[PDB]
Amino acid sequence: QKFHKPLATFSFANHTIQIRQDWRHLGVAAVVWDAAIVLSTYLEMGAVELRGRSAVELGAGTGLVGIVAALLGAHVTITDRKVALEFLKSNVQANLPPHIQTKTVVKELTWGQNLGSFSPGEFDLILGADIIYLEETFTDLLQTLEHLCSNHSVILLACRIRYERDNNFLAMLERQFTVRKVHYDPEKDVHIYEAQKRNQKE
Ligand SMILES: Nc1ncnc2c1ncn2[C@@H]1O[C@H](CSCC[C@H](N)C(=O)O)[C@@H](O)[C@H]1O
């Protein structure tokens, strides 16, 4: 029902964020999911180092998490697939001051595709809010995390565990990475997992 609203408004990092929404004509990438609100709240509370830190957001959708992380001092590469790009670029540009904008990159990253255009030790922080849902690209997503996550890098995945497939991806993630519960929101039923490369000796 919140999805039907043409505009979703939030207060994060001493700023009013006005997200344009389009559930009807664009769908999933054009609405703010609860996991993006929960992850953005967690980033604000202080357990994560953000100031001057290199960050990438995967499947940003509207871009809330990436916007909040940028406003909190990170150098964020806010990404999604080609079809979501235009709408993502519009919410980012209209919600960031120009001094934050120069430290922000809005570009495409389709999971497991053109991974070579990204440096394996480029990002210290990897973000994803409610991006676990499409079984057909689970391998694509794991190959992206494995390509981007250096030994120092931390992954923060905010999830709504809906079906068996969700636990399956988390088991796939656990094979190569340490996966630890760092936050749980009962009313929104969202868990934030932190992931790190397990065998750092390679
Ligand atoms: N193969 C793929 N490559 C990149 N992004 C993908 C993808 N498959 C799905 N996504 C993206 O994953 C997102 C799930 S919607 C979640 C949007 C946002 N983080 C929020 O929580 O509000 C969508 O934006 C969708 O475009």
Curated annotation (Swiss-Prot):
One of its GO terms (biological process) is negative regulation of chaperone-mediated protein folding. The keyword Protein biosynthesis does not apply. Its EC number is 2.1.1.-. It is found in: Cytoplasm. Its main location: cytoplasm. One of its GO terms (molecular function) is ATPase binding. It holds the Pfam family Methyltransf_16. One of its GO terms (cellular component) is nucleoplasm. InterPro entries: Methyltransf_16 (IPR019410), SAM-dependent_MTases_sf (IPR029063). S-adenosyl-L-methionine binds at residues 33, 59-61, 80, 111, 129. It catalyses: L-lysyl-[protein] + 3 S-adenosyl-L-methionine = N(6),N(6),N(6)-trimethyl-L-lysyl-[protein] + 3 S-adenosyl-L-homocysteine + 3 H(+). Keywords: Cytoplasm, Methyltransferase, S-adenosyl-L-methionine, Transferase. The keyword Transferase applies. Belongs to the methyltransferase superfamily. METTL21 family. Protein-lysine methyltransferase that selectively trimethylates residues in heat shock protein 70 (HSP70) family members. Contributes to the in vivo trimethylation of Lys residues in HSPA1 and HSPA8. In vitro methylates 'Lys-561' in HSPA1, 'Lys-564' in HSPA2, 'Lys-585' in HSPA5, 'Lys-563' in HSPA6 and 'Lys-561' in HSPA8. Interacts with heat shock protein 70 family members; at least some of these proteins are methylation substrates. This is Protein N-lysine methyltransferase METTL21A. The lineage of its organism: Eukaryota, Metazoa, Chordata, Craniata, Vertebrata. The gene is METTL21A.
